[PDB]
Amino acid sequence: RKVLVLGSGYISEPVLEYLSRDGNIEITVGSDMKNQIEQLGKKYNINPVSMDICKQEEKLGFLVAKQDLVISLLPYVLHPLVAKACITNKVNMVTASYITPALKELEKSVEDAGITIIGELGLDPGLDHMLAMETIDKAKEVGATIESYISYCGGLPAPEHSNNPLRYKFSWSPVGVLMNVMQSATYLLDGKVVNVAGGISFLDAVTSMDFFPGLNLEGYPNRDSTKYAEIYGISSAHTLLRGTLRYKGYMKALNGFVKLGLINREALPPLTWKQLLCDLVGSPSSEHDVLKEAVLKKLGGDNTQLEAAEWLGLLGDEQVPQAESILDALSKHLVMKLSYGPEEKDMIVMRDSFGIRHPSGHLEHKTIDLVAYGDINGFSAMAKTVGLPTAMAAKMLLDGEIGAKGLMGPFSKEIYGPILERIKAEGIIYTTQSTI
Amino acid sequence: RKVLVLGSGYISEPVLEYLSRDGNIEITVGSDMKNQIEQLGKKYNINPVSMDICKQEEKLGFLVAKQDLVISLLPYVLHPLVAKACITNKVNMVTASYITPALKELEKSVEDAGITIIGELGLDPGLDHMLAMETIDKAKEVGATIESYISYCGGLPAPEHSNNPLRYKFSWSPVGVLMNVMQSATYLLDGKVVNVAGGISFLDAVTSMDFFPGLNLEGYPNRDSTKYAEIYGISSAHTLLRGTLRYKGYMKALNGFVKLGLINREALPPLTWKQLLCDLVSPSSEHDVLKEAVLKKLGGDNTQLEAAEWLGLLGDEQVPQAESILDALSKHLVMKLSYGPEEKDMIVMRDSFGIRHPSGHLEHKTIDLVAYGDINGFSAMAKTVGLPTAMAAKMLLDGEIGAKGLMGPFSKEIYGPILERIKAEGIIYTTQSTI
Numbered sequence: 001r002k003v004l005v006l007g008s009g010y011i012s013e014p015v016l017e018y019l020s021r022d023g024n025i026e027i028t029v030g031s032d033m034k035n036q037i038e039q040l041g042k043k044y045n046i047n048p049v050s051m052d053i054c055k056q057e058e059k060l061g062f063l064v065a066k067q068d069l070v071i072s073l074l075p076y077v078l079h080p081l082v083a084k085a086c087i088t089n090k091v092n093m094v095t096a097s098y099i100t101p102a103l104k105e106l107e108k109s110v111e112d113a114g115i116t117i118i119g120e121l122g123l124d125p126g127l128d129h130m131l132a133m134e135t136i137d138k139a140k141e142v143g144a145t146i147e148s149y150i151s152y153c154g155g156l157p158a159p160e161h162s163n164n165p166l167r168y169k170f171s172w173s174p175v176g177v178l179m180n181v182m183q184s185a186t187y188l189l190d191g192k193v194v195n196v197a198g199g200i201s202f203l204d205a206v207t208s209m210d211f212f213p214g215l216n217l218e219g220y221p222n223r224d225s226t227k228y229a230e231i232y233g234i235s236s237a238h239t240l241l242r243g244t245l246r247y248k249g250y251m252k253a254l255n256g257f258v259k260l261g262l263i264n265r266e267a268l269p270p271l272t273w274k275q276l277l278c279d280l281v282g283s284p285s286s287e288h289d290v291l292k293e294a295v296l297k298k299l300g301g302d303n304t305q306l307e308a309a310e311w312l313g314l315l316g317d318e319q320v321p322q323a324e325s326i327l328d329a330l331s332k333h334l335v336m337k338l339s340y341g342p343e344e345k346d347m348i349v350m351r352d353s354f355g356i357r358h359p360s361g362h363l364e365h366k367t368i369d370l371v372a373y374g375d376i377n378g379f380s381a382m383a384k385t386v387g388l389p390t391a392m393a394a395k396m397l398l399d400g401e402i403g404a405k406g407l408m409g410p411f412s413k414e415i416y417g418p419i420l421e422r423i424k425a426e427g428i429i430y431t432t433q434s435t436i
Numbered sequence: 437r438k439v440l441v442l443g444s445g446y447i448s449e450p451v452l453e454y455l456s457r458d459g460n461i462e463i464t465v466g467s468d469m470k471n472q473i474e475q476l477g478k479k480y481n482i483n484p485v486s487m488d489i490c491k492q493e494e495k496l497g498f499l500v501a502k503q504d505l506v507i508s509l510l511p512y513v514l515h516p517l518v519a520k521a522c523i524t525n526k527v528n529m530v531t532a533s534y535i536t537p538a539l540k541e542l543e544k545s546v547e548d549a550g551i552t553i554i555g556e557l558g559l560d561p562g563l564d565h566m567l568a569m570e571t572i573d574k575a576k577e578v579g580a581t582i583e584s585y586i587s588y589c590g591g592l593p594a595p596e597h598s599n600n601p602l603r604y605k606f607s608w609s610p611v612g613v614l615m616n617v618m619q620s621a622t623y624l625l626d627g628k629v630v631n632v633a634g635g636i637s638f639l640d641a642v643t644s645m646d647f648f649p650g651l652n653l654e655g656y657p658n659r660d661s662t663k664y665a666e667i668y669g670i671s672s673a674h675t676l677l678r679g680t681l682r683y684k685g686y687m688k689a690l691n692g693f694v695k696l697g698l699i700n701r702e703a704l705p706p707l708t709w710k711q712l713l714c715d716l717v718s719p720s721s722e723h724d725v726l727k728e729a730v731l732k733k734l735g736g737d738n739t740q741l742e743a744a745e746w747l748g749l750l751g752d753e754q755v756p757q758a759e760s761i762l763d764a765l766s767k768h769l770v771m772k773l774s775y776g777p778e779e780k781d782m783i784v785m786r787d788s789f790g791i792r793h794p795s796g797h798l799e800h801k802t803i804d805l806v807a808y809g810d811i812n813g814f815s816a817m818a819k820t821v822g823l824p825t826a827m828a829a830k831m832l833l834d835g836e837i838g839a840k841g842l843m844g845p846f847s848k849e850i851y852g853p854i855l856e857r858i859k860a861e862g863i864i865y866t867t868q869s870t871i
């Protein structure tokens with residue numbers, strides 16, 4: 001019963017805690033920050049291993065060969081290296097990340113090696129899949145058909161911590177999501193494939209999410225959504241739309257960063273934000289602060305967007321963080337200024353809406369609400385919902401509860417059934433309501 | 437250490453849980469609802485005692501004499517009965533209730549008995565006092581003076597459970613809250629005493645609380661704010677205002693019930709809501725579309741009408757038996773908007789001072805406290821009420837409070853340790869100042 005956890009990010013702690021409970025699981029932890037592992041070693045009995053998986057992919061193979069299960073909590077690019085070691089060594093594996101084309105290229109040997117690899121555990125993906133599949137299957141067991149599926153999700157700060165220009169606090173580097181604002185989105189509505197362009201015009205797709213009168217939510221569609229007809233088996237539905245939730249004004253706040261060229265991949269030019277932004281407003285590069293400001297508003301001139309820039313210090317003398325790109329730096333800056341404090345609460349909000357046509361002809365509207373709040377004295381809501389389902393599927397693999405073999409997501413009741421039940425004991429509870 | 441808990445309502449459960457932790461406290465629980473006590477006995481190691489305080493006063497003296505401490509979690513009217521047994525048997529006592537004139541009557545015998553009775557623990561009163569005094573004392577000890585105190589508080593549903601016409605769910609009987617909309621409010625602003633009358637016009641006093649861009653809160657003043665100058669020692673302030681927080685649209689929805697005459701203490705006239713509601717507008721009977729247009733007349737805001745049908749007040753449903761039209765409404769609101777077993781409640785609390793320093797500069801300080809209920813545990817209201825009660829109980833046992841007599845939690849000796857140990861339970865309040 002030996003388990004190797006790759007990566008020691010804060011998503012790892014609620015996993016260690018969950019698997020440590022019975023004491024019959026030998027936990028090894030490996031990563032490239034010896035500090036992260038030292039702190040974790042104080043709270044849980046774990047064999048620590050310092051390793052750069054990218055560079056020492058052979059020491060990784062030797063380590064992998066010794067385990068009964070590998071849980072990859074590494075940045076998802078590295079998952080293929082880990083799956084390779086697991087495939088040659090016949091060791092089961094789980095991840096909390098999208099099964100990429102790269103990792104899917106390996107699907108056959110995974111079935112030839114006779115191992116099980118369960119990916120797309122976690123929050124999004126993960127619990128979203130499991131909630132959808134649960135009710136999509138429940139409809140089919142009664143001869144019903146899915147006509148519409150609208151799902152929205154978002155990890156946010158608890159509302160009392162929402163008073164900043166972005167109405168947001170970042171659980172990790174936003175390098176990935178920020179760039180996604182420049183993307184087009186695609187979804188299905190009333191039988192027609194709908195496409196919305198990203199960039200400056202993406203703010204037009206943003207909409208008010210009025211599920212809860214007490215909460216000020218805006219939503220906007222994800223990149224694709226249309227893929228879920230095949231993924232979930234709902235080819236008959238006329239609308240499929242998955243989206244993200246924020247507090248109102250966040251996207252407008254980002255719309256500014258796009259206008260200023262901050263969501264940009266180029267490299268960085270004693271550098272300060274006013275200098276860096278001077279270079280970005282064409283004027284550069286050592287002019288009076290008020291002159292720099294007159295030009296920022298020119299790309300506008302919306303004061304709310306200017307107010308957000310000043311509040312963060314992007315027009316000030318503060319030093320730009322070292323990074324290989326403007327975005328990389330901006331992300332590292334937003335982290336220094338809007339990370340969660342040790343006594344601040346985050347939030348998870350998830351609302352699904354299914355249109356279920358029954359063979360009798362009745363149209364049922366089913367909604368599922370899942371809201372969780374962080375525990376200051378325990379784990380965050382994001383850490384609970386990302387790390388628990390991963391940790392739960394791992395124990396199920398150990399305890400021998402998943403017979404399916406190969407490379408798979410968490411779509412079969414064999415997987416989502418037990419996880420959805422045992423997360424209740426952990427405070428992740430959802431609620432349902434139907435009407436006809 | 438032996439402790440007697442009087443009352444087995446839902447506030448007792450987070451108190452039992454807190455006292456049970458060290459295992460060196462023998463808990464006795466007594467009340468008149470046997471089945472509440474049985475359920476608690478399954479979850480906690482407790483001596484169950486069936487007792488009606490009004491009738492078995494003698495049995496009450498016997499049990500108290502055996503304890504090191506009595507925690508009265510009974511309806512506050514009975515607390516004096518419990519105080520007598522404690523004074524006579526020289527046993528310390530704590531409550532979570534406003535210290536009434538009746539109870540202050542005994543204040544001398546409490547000091548003659550040499551015991552401590554700490555009241556006004558809990559949320560309001562309780563945590564309200566302790567947060568204010570914490571900050572006021574900090575200002576006064578560096579020679580500062582309080583110029584303004586604006587405090588807002590509210591127990592509400594967590595925002596995910598706010599989708600109903602009132603944006604509210606009731607933790608207990610709303611008779612108290614409903615009637616307060618008919619009472620006037622009084623406070624002090626910029627040196628001038630402000631008066632706002634209740635009833636229909638109280639909706640004009642309602643205001644937007646924009647502390648949190650993510651939350652849609654409204655606020656309004658309580659019955660009496662000016663009394664807090666004496667309670668906190670801040671006669672110096674030019675502004676005193678304590679108020680209640682709700683989700684936007686609650687007071688408007690309540691404004692409808694008042695327009696319709698539902699907030700009324702007179703008696704009720706096989707009676708149905710449509711039948712009763714016709715008598716309040718024509719009877720008796722008959723057709724729904726007739727009432728709907730007539731209900732609309734007392735308005736004519738249809739939004740307030742949307743709330744009434746949604747609650748079934750225009751329907752064939754039977755009105756509950758009750759001594760008054762109100763109360764009937766309360767019992768109905770309880771039947772239709774109580775908390776389900778998987779719904780989360782909330783506590784939201786913001787204070788704003790108000791502080792002039794001897795250097796002459798003006799400090800604005802805000803204290804935020806927010807708590808959420810736990811589906812697998814206790815509600816936010818239960819935690820914030822029972823924890824400060826249970827903690828002061830442990831402090832009295834463990835000997836950390838030297839004061840004697842009848843007192844609230846205003847002294848650093850009490851509120852200090854309590855506030856510190858509350859944070860350890862995940863209930864966090866944060867302070868922020870600027871100039």
Ligand SMILES: NC(=O)c1ccc[n+]([C@@H]2O[C@H](COP(=O)([O-])OP(=O)(O)OC[C@H]3O[C@@H](n4cnc5c(N)ncnc54)[C@H](O)[C@@H]3O)[C@@H](O)[C@H]2O)c1
Binds near residue numbers: 072074075096126
């Ligand atoms: N399903 C979900 O909802 C969800 C949400 C967020 C993150 N995730 C997944 O969480 C995982 C970790 O989060 P992250 O992607 O932000 O990365 P991260 O930067 O937080 O790093 C995670 C851990 O891996 C370590 N690490 C990084 N590179 C390493 C290397 N070359 N060798 C050894 N250790 C290395 C890091 O030190 C860290 O301890 C990812 O796989 C991510 O896709 C899933």
Ligand SMILES: NC(=O)c1ccc[n+]([C@@H]2O[C@H](COP(=O)([O-])OP(=O)(O)OC[C@H]3O[C@@H](n4cnc5c(N)ncnc54)[C@H](O)[C@@H]3O)[C@@H](O)[C@H]2O)c1
Binds near residue numbers: 488
């Ligand atoms: N400071 C605060 O924020 C706050 C908030 C809520 C409640 N409280 C206090 O909690 C206490 C109880 O709450 P509640 O009144 O809403 O519920 P409640 O009136 O039902 O009282 C709870 C318990 O008292 C028992 N009880 C009532 N009469 C009894 C009798 N004659 N003999 C034996 N047991 C009797 C009940 O059976 C019940 O178990 C009250 O004193 C209230 O002041 C304080």
